[PDB]
Amino acid sequence: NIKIFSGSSHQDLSQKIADRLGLELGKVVTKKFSNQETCVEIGESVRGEDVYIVQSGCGEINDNLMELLIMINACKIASASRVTAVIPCFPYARQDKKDKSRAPISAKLVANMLSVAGADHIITMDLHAAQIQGFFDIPVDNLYAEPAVLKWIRENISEWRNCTIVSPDAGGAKRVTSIADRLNVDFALIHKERDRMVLVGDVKDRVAILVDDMADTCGTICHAADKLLSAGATRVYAILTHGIFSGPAISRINNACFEAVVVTNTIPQEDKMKHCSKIQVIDISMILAEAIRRTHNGESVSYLF
Amino acid sequence: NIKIFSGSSHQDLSQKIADRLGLELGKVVTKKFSNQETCVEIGESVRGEDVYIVQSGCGEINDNLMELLIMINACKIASASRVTAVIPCFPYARQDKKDKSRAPISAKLVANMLSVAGADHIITMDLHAAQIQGFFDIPVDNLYAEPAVLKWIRENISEWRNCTIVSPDAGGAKRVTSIADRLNVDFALIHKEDRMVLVGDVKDRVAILVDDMADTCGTICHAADKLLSAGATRVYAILTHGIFSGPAISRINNACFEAVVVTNTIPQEDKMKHCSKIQVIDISMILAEAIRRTHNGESVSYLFSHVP
Amino acid sequence: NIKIFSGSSHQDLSQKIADRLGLELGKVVTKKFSNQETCVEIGESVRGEDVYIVQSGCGEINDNLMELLIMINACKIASASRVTAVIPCFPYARQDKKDKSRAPISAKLVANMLSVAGADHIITMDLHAAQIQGFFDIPVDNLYAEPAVLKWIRENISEWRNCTIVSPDAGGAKRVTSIADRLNVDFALIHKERDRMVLVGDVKDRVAILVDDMADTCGTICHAADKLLSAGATRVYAILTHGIFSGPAISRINNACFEAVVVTNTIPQEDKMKHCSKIQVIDISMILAEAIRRTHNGESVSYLF
Amino acid sequence: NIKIFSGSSHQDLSQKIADRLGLELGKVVTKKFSNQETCVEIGESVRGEDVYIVQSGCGEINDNLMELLIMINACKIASASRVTAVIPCFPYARQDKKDKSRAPISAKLVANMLSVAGADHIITMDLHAAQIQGFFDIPVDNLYAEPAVLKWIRENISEWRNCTIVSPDAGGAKRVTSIADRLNVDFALIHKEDRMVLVGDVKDRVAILVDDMADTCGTICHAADKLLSAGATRVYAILTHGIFSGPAISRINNACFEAVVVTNTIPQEDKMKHCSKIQVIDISMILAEAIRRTHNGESVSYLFSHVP
Amino acid sequence: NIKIFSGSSHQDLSQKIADRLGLELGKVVTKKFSNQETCVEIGESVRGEDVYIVQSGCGEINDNLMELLIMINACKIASASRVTAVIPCFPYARQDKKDKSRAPISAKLVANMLSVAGADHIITMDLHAAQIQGFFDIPVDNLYAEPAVLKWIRENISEWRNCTIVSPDAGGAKRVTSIADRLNVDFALIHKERDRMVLVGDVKDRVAILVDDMADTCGTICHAADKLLSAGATRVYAILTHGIFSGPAISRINNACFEAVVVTNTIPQEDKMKHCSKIQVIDISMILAEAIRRTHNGESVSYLF
Amino acid sequence: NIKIFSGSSHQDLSQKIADRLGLELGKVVTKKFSNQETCVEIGESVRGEDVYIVQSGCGEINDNLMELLIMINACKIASASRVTAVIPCFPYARQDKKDKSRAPISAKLVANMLSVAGADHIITMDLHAAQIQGFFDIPVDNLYAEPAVLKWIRENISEWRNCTIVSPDAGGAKRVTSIADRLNVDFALIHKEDRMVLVGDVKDRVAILVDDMADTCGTICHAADKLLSAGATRVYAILTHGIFSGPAISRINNACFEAVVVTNTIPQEDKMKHCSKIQVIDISMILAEAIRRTHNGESVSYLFSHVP
Numbered sequence A, C, E: 001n002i003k004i005f006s007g008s009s010h011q012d013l014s015q016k017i018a019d020r021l022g023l024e025l026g027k028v029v030t031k032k033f034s035n036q037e038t039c040v041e042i043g044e045s046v047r048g049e050d051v052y053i054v055q056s057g058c059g060e061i062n063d064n065l066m067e068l069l070i071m072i073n074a075c076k077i078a079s080a081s082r083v084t085a086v087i088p089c090f091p092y093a094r095q096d097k098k099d100k101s102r103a104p105i106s107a108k109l110v111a112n113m114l115s116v117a118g119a120d121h122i123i124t125m126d127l128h129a130a131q132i133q134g135f136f137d138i139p140v141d142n143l144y145a146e147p148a149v150l151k152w153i154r155e156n157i158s159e160w161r162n163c164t165i166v167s168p169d170a171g172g173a174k175r176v177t178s179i180a181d182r183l184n185v186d187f188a189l190i191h192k193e194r195d196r197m198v199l200v201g202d203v204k205d206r207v208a209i210l211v212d213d214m215a216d217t218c219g220t221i222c223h224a225a226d227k228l229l230s231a232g233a234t235r236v237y238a239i240l241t242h243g244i245f246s247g248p249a250i251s252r253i254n255n256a257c258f259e260a261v262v263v264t265n266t267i268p269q270e271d272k273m274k275h276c277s278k279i280q281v282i283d284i285s286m287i288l289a290e291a292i293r294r295t296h297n298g299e300s301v302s303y304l305f
Numbered sequence B, D, F: 001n002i003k004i005f006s007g008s009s010h011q012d013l014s015q016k017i018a019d020r021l022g023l024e025l026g027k028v029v030t031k032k033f034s035n036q037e038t039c040v041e042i043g044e045s046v047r048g049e050d051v052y053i054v055q056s057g058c059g060e061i062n063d064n065l066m067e068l069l070i071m072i073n074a075c076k077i078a079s080a081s082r083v084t085a086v087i088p089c090f091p092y093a094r095q096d097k098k099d100k101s102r103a104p105i106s107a108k109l110v111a112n113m114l115s116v117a118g119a120d121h122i123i124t125m126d127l128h129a130a131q132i133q134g135f136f137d138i139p140v141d142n143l144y145a146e147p148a149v150l151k152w153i154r155e156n157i158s159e160w161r162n163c164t165i166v167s168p169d170a171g172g173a174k175r176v177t178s179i180a181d182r183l184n185v186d187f188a189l190i191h192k193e194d195r196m197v198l199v200g201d202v203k204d205r206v207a208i209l210v211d212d213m214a215d216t217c218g219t220i221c222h223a224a225d226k227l228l229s230a231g232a233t234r235v236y237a238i239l240t241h242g243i244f245s246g247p248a249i250s251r252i253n254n255a256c257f258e259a260v261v262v263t264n265t266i267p268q269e270d271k272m273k274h275c276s277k278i279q280v281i282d283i284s285m286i287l288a289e290a291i292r293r294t295h296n297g298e299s300v301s302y303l304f305s306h307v308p
Helices: A012-020 A061-077 A106-117 A130-135 A146-156 A158-162 A170-183 A219-230 A249-254 A270-275 A285-296 B011-021 B061-077 B106-117 B130-135 B146-156 B170-183 B218-229 B248-253 B269-274 B284-296 B301-305 C012-020 C061-077 C106-117 C130-135 C146-156 C158-162 C170-183 C219-230 C249-254 C270-275 C285-296 D011-021 D061-077 D106-117 D130-135 D146-156 D170-183 D218-229 D248-253 D269-274 D284-296 D301-305 E012-020 E061-077 E106-117 E130-135 E146-156 E158-162 E170-183 E219-230 E249-254 E270-275 E285-296 F011-021 F061-077 F106-117 F130-135 F146-156 F170-183 F218-229 F248-253 F269-274 F284-296 F301-305
Strands: A002-006 A028-030 A040-042 A050-054 A082-087 A121-125 A140-143 A164-167 A186-192 A197-200 A208-215 A236-243 A261-264 A279-282 B002-006 B028-032 B038-042 B050-054 B082-087 B121-125 B140-143 B164-167 B186-192 B196-200 B207-214 B235-242 B257-263 B278-281 C002-006 C028-030 C040-042 C050-054 C082-087 C121-125 C140-143 C164-167 C186-192 C197-200 C208-215 C236-243 C261-264 C279-282 D002-006 D028-032 D038-042 D050-054 D082-087 D121-125 D140-143 D164-167 D186-192 D196-200 D207-214 D235-242 D257-263 D278-281 E002-006 E028-030 E040-042 E050-054 E082-087 E121-125 E140-143 E164-167 E186-192 E197-200 E208-215 E236-243 E261-264 E279-282 F002-006 F028-032 F038-042 F050-054 F082-087 F121-125 F140-143 F164-167 F186-192 F196-200 F207-214 F235-242 F257-263 F278-281
Touching: A002 A012, A002 A285, A012 A050, A012 A285, A040 A061, A050 A061, A050 A285, A061 A082, A061 A106, A061 F061, A061 F106, A082 A285, A106 A130, A106 F061, A106 F106, A121 A285, A130 A140, A130 B130, A140 A285, A146 A170, A146 A236, A146 A261, A146 A279, A164 A170, A170 A186, A170 A208, A170 B170, A170 B186, A186 A219, A186 B170, A186 B186, A186 B196, A197 A219, A197 B186, A208 A219, A219 A236, A219 A249, A249 A270, A270 A279, B002 B011, B002 B284, B011 B050, B011 B284, B038 B061, B050 B061, B050 B284, B061 B082, B061 B106, B061 C061, B061 C106, B082 B284, B106 B130, B106 C061, B106 C106, B121 B284, B130 B140, B140 B284, B146 B170, B146 B235, B146 B257, B146 B278, B146 B301, B164 B170, B170 B186, B170 B207, B186 B218, B196 B218, B207 B218, B218 B235, B218 B248, B218 B257, B248 B269, B269 B278, B284 B301, C002 C012, C002 C285, C012 C050, C012 C285, C040 C061, C050 C061, C050 C285, C061 C082, C061 C106, C082 C285, C106 C130, C121 C285, C130 C140, C130 D130, C140 C285, C146 C170, C146 C236, C146 C261, C146 C279, C164 C170, C170 C186, C170 C208, C170 D170, C170 D186, C186 C219, C186 D170, C186 D186, C186 D196, C197 C219, C197 D186, C208 C219, C219 C236, C219 C249, C249 C270, C270 C279, D002 D011, D002 D284, D011 D050, D011 D284, D038 D061, D050 D061, D050 D284, D061 D082, D061 D106, D061 E061, D061 E106, D082 D284, D106 D130, D106 E061, D106 E106, D121 D284, D130 D140, D140 D284, D146 D170, D146 D235, D146 D257, D146 D278, D146 D301, D164 D170, D170 D186, D170 D207, D186 D218, D196 D218, D207 D218, D218 D235, D218 D248, D218 D257, D248 D269, D269 D278, D284 D301, E002 E012, E002 E285, E012 E050, E012 E285, E040 E061, E050 E061, E050 E285, E061 E082, E061 E106, E082 E285, E106 E130, E121 E285, E130 E140, E130 F130, E140 E285, E146 E170, E146 E236, E146 E261, E146 E279, E164 E170, E170 E186, E170 E208, E170 F170, E170 F186, E186 E219, E186 F170, E186 F186, E186 F196, E197 E219, E197 F186, E208 E219, E219 E236, E219 E249, E249 E270, E270 E279, F002 F011, F002 F284, F011 F050, F011 F284, F038 F061, F050 F061, F050 F284, F061 F082, F061 F106, F082 F284, F106 F130, F121 F284, F130 F140, F140 F284, F146 F170, F146 F235, F146 F257, F146 F278, F146 F301, F164 F170, F170 F186, F170 F207, F186 F218, F196 F218, F207 F218, F218 F235, F218 F248, F218 F257, F248 F269, F269 F278, F284 F301
Parallel strands: A002 A050, A050 A082, A082 A121, A121 A140, A164 A186, A164 A208, A208 A236, A236 A261, A261 A279, B002 B050, B050 B082, B082 B121, B121 B140, B164 B186, B164 B207, B207 B235, B235 B257, B257 B278, C002 C050, C050 C082, C082 C121, C121 C140, C164 C186, C164 C208, C208 C236, C236 C261, C261 C279, D002 D050, D050 D082, D082 D121, D121 D140, D164 D186, D164 D207, D207 D235, D235 D257, D257 D278, E002 E050, E050 E082, E082 E121, E121 E140, E164 E186, E164 E208, E208 E236, E236 E261, E261 E279, F002 F050, F050 F082, F082 F121, F121 F140, F164 F186, F164 F207, F207 F235, F235 F257, F257 F278
Antiparallel strands: A028 A040, A186 A197, B028 B038, B186 B196, C028 C040, C186 C197, D028 D038, D186 D196, E028 E040, E186 E197, F028 F038, F186 F196
């Protein structure tokens, strides 16, 4: 009655999820045409079934989005009973406001494409902005890596009782104060004179944990680390839920005084972990598997929060 | 071929806007029942016209919202060419996320209600969260009171070049860092844990609490004490939307504020009578200009950093 | 699997319905903000459930409507399987046509808001105009108080065999002729020179029963009564399904020669019944409970007609 | 930049309207199959233009409806700037409620079909029930034949100042009381139980049966007898829509009517040949005016109580 | 739980389908008003049921379409759980493109009307163009008569091993090459100088089987037959899935050298078969019944392909 | 009040179109990330304007599609009066049916994406299947390269009056019979079973393979051999959309083609450098004209059989 499919080369996360649920990934034929034009073909019947498609992790964001939309469309017209998009890292989530410009609100375009593609429900983790849930009319379940992060902080950082949760920018305030409140420690924030960086909050003679929802080139995260050192920080960690490590990223964190860099399984990290030793990954496949099972059985998903 | 109508008897703001455009407000016959069931009738033809309806300032948010929706409906089925909702202070804006609870995203519901009611365009000031524009599919022009605030500051605070812009909560960091950078001064943030914590330099400086709105004012009043305790010379509070419900007025009269500044996105006259610490910045010209430019198809972005 | 929630202070009707169904009302947190801004929070999971929200009866029509829409939205995004709005007295139902004016068709605005809020089905009683069912694309079940009214007329009025069903205005013709046909008696109608009132039909030397779907200030209903007396009516009753008694209402019916005024439970009457003795209420909670149960079990609801 | 097209060969009404606007009807190539499958082709460009399609009077309601929908579709995908459906007599209008049965609300389905077909505006005359405007989300202008009826009455019935306007059923009370009040005379109502009952004064007065439409005329014919039996001097019947299907014509030729008056919202020529009691009120000018004003963005409400 | 209704006078196909499923056709009241205005009334409850309405076969295409839409609407607002339109011969399917004219895409108008009427799923046979499935957003299952046609060709035509599948026009190329490939024979195509007819492909001294999705007046089909004869064809058959035989049709095929004309049950043929002997019908009721049963039980429908 | 913008740096076609209209391309600030996440910013106001966005020729179809959708979104929420998507070569057009498989109808998904993105009108050239217009509800103008092809033929092939127009597959019969009839010559069709079969007269005649698009060219290359083997004098291949991915170029350089002709609906410069058998027909004037007429509300059908 339940069916789980995956997209593109990536299958690590999808395979983990399927295993935890005691299922095999559904059969899906995929042939890439001329100019990356995506071809997808559901290798089995999904008629009357509760379908879950897990987003691929093949870097190319536009090929991934299209493959996901095409799969959703194929299942829908193949009379699937319900289609849910499991998207650990919501694409274009950062493009969620005009920001004083003649810019697109791409995250809303995406929510609309997903909806028109035929998605009936969304399962994602740590939306860049909680307001994005409102970009849909269909139900969205936004999971959190926070519990896992807190737990990891307590078990791997000895001086955590007196550490400081630091935000790379002004926009991450709420995220770090929330984590800082749970741990009962101090918080601090860095801001790039929008240039030089300014820091508010107490980090002197104590471990500084940089927390952010995501990191790409890691330019910011690496500069914030140097700043924290100059501020007299003991050791600076960097915890991200989504590790879009790209470009300089790999070399940057190595050449950075990061004691360690923790990221989740929301994006493939096997390739980068090899060329970067200070990187550790928190597996969130169990959380995702549990939300699917609970969504299917109609049980509480908020429990995982 | 422009037509401007006002929500209810609170013509106040809507009449200033109309004056600035060289127009009179459109005729609207409004009958109301005991259960507050709103009756509306457009007293003039709006056929083929560019209509603007400015939300009333009554105070009762559900009556005002329904009256706005009803007027939009009436104009749309009366063949208005276009209907724009001018909503200075967006209703339910603070209810824009589930926040880890089985809560409604009321701001999204409101956007959908305005949409199905027949709204073709929205004009508002300082949405509680910029992401709210994404709750609509129709175009939204979110005007800023910033230019007017930066001007009030430069013109009313002698020490502005050495002041600190303070956010009353963590969520406002971006807004204050933004004003601090334009002015080239320090910024600071207050985070409520039931204890307030302050990060940022305010010692021997004038502290300016800046936020989008103030309701019961319990937060800004407490932040002010915190700031003085931290060595601030004097404290100001500048919010774009002055709700001031409940004990706010009494709370402000007893607070150590040098002054509390708000725009007139919400009627402030009654409140001022009982509170002298309040000063109002008029934003009718900014709204009047967005409407005029919207109608003429001219740039409205000019208003984001320019006081007409 | 089934869940029933109620809104605002009112809970009399909702509690009766829940009891008849052997259920407790679902947990819903409610805190009213500054200017009556409505805050609602579903106190329990409704994921995969058949949900029924019963409209509150706290007079303020706009606060009631909003609270209902907000509750519907919260349940919908909380992954409820289906949401049904049980609205005994459909708000703005009288505003269902332009009527030769540049007026809104508010009843349609409401149907649209309800639909966009996420309602999948509507259960109401005695719609002001049957055409309102067409203002929705979703299924609407319009229940009738008629059977109960007829029954009440037979058991409480001795001279009913030869009474006259009277309509307060020209617009209630169909309503009274239908009831008059079932009882096999005469019908009459009153009209305000649209002023003085005119009456057509035979009421001389016989009990006159004024029937209408609703009454607010009761100005009309009270004038029609005086008229009926001058016409030589024996005794004049007034039967309404929706008793929006407001303003003068209470005092008016007392100072009116009404033998009795019968209304249904669709709107709270406990407060007004105290200051008005000639008022009797027909409880329709059983009818509503039965339509919900039948809607849930997929059984015939028309049976209740 | 206005374009008017006719449903089918029943140019009749559509040609009068066109004449009154100083226009010719647009070219339309129409091919039809044996199974009545309608083929349509807009013989001229409608790109960027204000299009009006007037429903044909063929008689076969489903063929006419489909032909109308098809033409609307063709114009819309051919980039017409706006497409208005001019439907004098709204199809399935009598099917506007479930009426306690597991019935379809066909009038709502029709409104949805016209909407999805691409209609941006509707112009009709005397909807069977005003609530029908609410079946659409697009604007609807529901014109009244009342002004024309009140004029025919004042001009054709000597005793109009002492006549009685009678409704053939309970549902028409509002419509007759409305005409009775404007004229300042009595009104009466007939209710069918299989026996008719009459309430209202008709004794020694001219009785005018007024309704929105007459089909088989079984009702108005029986009401007329009832009225004469009640002491009416003579009986008239004035309906806006003259369907006259089945035995209607034979039924009218044998009825005690002084005359039967209808508008030309439906072709009446063939019917008149076999029935001399029929007289037609031309409403083309009223429709032509609503179109002209719709196009110019001018008040159409003027027509509700004024015969152009 | 499952309910099958039929429309208008036609009930042959609908009755066959119901029998194969072991059911009686649902009760539906139908009274035709003045000018063919369609009146429909569901004679039984369909609340919470999986409903299937089979299109009538009463020639008048517009009365049939409307009756179908009206039935769909009535079931939908009567709280039916799901409504599926079973339409063997999709109306206006040939009007599926502008074709270099200011023409309507009627097939899309129809798909939209069906959708707005409330249809949740479509079951049809041999769509004039497969692209029409894309005119809907709802699931469409397009069945094929091909298997049955091939089978019939093998059992009724002795020289089939060396016959030629002929297309009446250029537009039927794909249809005939597909059938010709399955049988492993030659294909040919005829074209009207768009006049005289041209023929490409080898038909000399061999049976010619004209294949087309539909035939109305049969003008084309009959001319193609004469052409095939002049080309030196042994015997010319004509196989159509949809036999819209109208106008001259009946007389035309008789006066035509057609060895035989095969058509399916998608349209009533009992009346025409009497006045035309060379006509044979392949019953597709079992195929339709099987798709309904499979759609209801959530089993594979593609199996029938 | 017309505004034309280009998808990406592949201004090529979009710049020619702009030149032909006497305009410059609108300013667009485009930032792109490593994961190819597209960032766009309209560098000028489009408020109340008629906007045209011409899809880029980058090559990566998903990046180009997303960039197009994003730009449409940005313009729409920036209050453009109308936004038209000029898509010379429609993405996923070949994926327009299930074809007896549990496949997606990607061309329909793309139409829906463009619709919800906010597209009000589509302008494309030679949709793979005319039925694709029906995948939208908004108007679509599907331009033909035929007039330009018929002209290239008459002007470049001496024997055109005695040539044969050949379809590389069964599905193209209609398209070739159509060109064959206008020219008044023979036609032929090739059907791939893994063996090609040819029906039609090509003996001693110049054979012109005509199709809407050519990708890997495996088919046209094989069809050419087949044609020469059948007695064709020489073979040509004329496709409107020149994809030429994979081994196409190498495949064409080794094929027995006299020449391979394509339009510039897709950039062809890089391909031409490595392939001299390729010749390009410029269709910018045809696209420029459709835009100009679309904007002025003038007939665009004129272009279906007339080379501007």
